[PDB]
């Protein structure tokens, strides 16, 4: 089976600056009929894949001219000359010369904007949820860049591990930021054995870490 | 216009069978090869198989992980392509896509929207929805959508009238096997008690529709 190796696996592009993605195949994609069966796809977030380039260098109808492809044999390159917010998503190369048809692992492209610090909010568990026997504490990090952020839960000064989960949004097309939620889940019996609940946030846009706390049953 | 619509997906018990359809319009269906692809949640694109036009023998080709178990068929009179899956395993969970293979461009050119197939022993379960109430320039509030199966859920705010500032997070799979997610919105401080905020949650696999008002 033909292995398709894409590099890099992720790219952060300053708007208006070029991007270039490499695809190397384990065998030649040049066939005896003279054609090179290498194709480039884009999958925008939440969307179906769409074709960009066919047979190395041919733009599919309606694809903007800032996309081009080149290469031969086993080494190929996709170039986006001036990246825009609508170009964000995952780019795949694909070969059809051999069975099975195979894809590269995908290269994720984001917009690289100026650093932006998160706004932090904390939410205690609702009395509706408490009646059910479980307590979820939610910490929200709103509109920040880059995506890397550290959220730490601290309950009566003790750091928490293994009882929280994080989710991150895709990059917002309006301001090129991310948001993140972190949820600490405890049984209500364990929740009622402590008082102070804090989430502490570290981020490149913060000169000092930011803590949001509440006391159980005091607001 | 070229139109392709996948259907048939849903939750299925391991070991069982499921047949997906690709209903097409806008072209002479018989003249084209049709291809199936799949994408497991969070993962890359994978080719499943394709079936040639009857003008070239009408035979099909398959990826190694489905050979034997899956068969691709086509009904030229109805302009429909089929993917018949059997002996389904949990690792077959994916969005399955059908695509029209071009002639000049001899690859998958036009793709449908996909259909989610979930292969799991778990039962369907609707979600509980809890408020994330705002409290002490900009205020944040939201809804916590907890313990549902399978994917997906939809969340709107004020029946779609509130879109600026809304972030709906990807679902997380819990240690229990059930999913949860939150949806939040940042609103001006001036609009607390002035403007009412209601999150609309739909979980079609359960036929559950909950509209939760979030109060300060």
């Amino acid at each position: 089976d033909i292995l398709m190796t894409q590099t890099p696996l992720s790219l952060s592009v300053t708007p208006g600056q070029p991007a270039s993605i490499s695809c190397k195949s384990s065998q030649s994609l040049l066939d005896n009929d003279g054609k090179t069966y290498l194709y480039w796809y884009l999958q925008k977030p939440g969307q179906s894949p769409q074709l960009l380039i066919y047979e190395v260098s041919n733009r599919f109808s309606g694809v903007p001219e800032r996309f081009s492809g080149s290469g031969s044999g086993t080494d190929f390159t996709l170039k986006i000359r001036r990246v825009e917010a609508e170009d964000v998503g995952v780019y795949y190369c694909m070969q059809r010369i051999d069975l099975p048809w195979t894809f590269g692992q995908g290269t994720k492209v984001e917009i690289k904007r100026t650093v932006a610090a998160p706004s932090v909010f904390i939410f205690p568990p609702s009395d509706e949820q408490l009646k059910s026997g479980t307590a979820s504490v939610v910490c929200l990090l709103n509109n920040f860049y880059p995506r890397e952020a550290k959220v730490q839960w601290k309950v009566d000064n003790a750091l928490q591990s293994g009882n929280s989960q994080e989710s991150v949004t895709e990059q917002d097309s309006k301001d090129s930021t991310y948001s993140l939620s972190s949820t600490l889940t405890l049984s209500k019996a364990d929740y009622e054995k402590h008082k102070v609940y804090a989430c502490e946030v570290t981020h490149q846009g913060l000169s000092s870490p930011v803590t949001k706390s509440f006391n159980r049953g005091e607001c | 216009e070229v139109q392709l619509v996948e259907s048939g997906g849903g939750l299925v018990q391991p070991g069982r069978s499921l047949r997906l359809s690709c209903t097409t319009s806008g072209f002479t269906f018989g003249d084209y090869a049709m291809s199936w692809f799949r994408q497991a949640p969070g993962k890359g694109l994978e080719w499943v198989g394709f079936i040639r036009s009857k003008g070239f023998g009408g035979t099909a080709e398959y990826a190694a992980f489905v050979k034997g178990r899956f068969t691709i068929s086509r009904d030229d009179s109805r302009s429909i392509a089929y993917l018949q899956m059997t002996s389904l395993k949990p690792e077959d969970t994916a969005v399955y896509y059908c695509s029209r293979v071009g002639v000049v461009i001899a690859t998958a050119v036009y793709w449908g929207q996909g259909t989610l197939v979930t292969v799991s022993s778990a039962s369907t379960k609707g979600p509980s929805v809890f408020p994330l109430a705002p409290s002490s320039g900009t205020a944040a509030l939201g809804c916590l959508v907890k313990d549902y199966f399978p994917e997906p859920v939809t969340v709107s705010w004020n029946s779609g009238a509130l879109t600026s500032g809304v972030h709906t997070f990807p679902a997380v799979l819990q240690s229990s096997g059930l999913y949860s997610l939150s949806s939040v919105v940042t609103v001006p401080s001036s609009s607390l008690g002035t403007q009412t905020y209601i999150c609309n949650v739909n979980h079609k696999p359960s036929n559950t529709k909950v509209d939760k008002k979030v109060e300060p």
Partner: peptide, 11 residues
């Protein structure tokens, strides 16, 4: 491998 070609009969 002619079986990879979706637009020809591989025989």
């Amino acid at each position: 491998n002619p079986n990879a070609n979706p637009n020809a009969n591989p025989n």
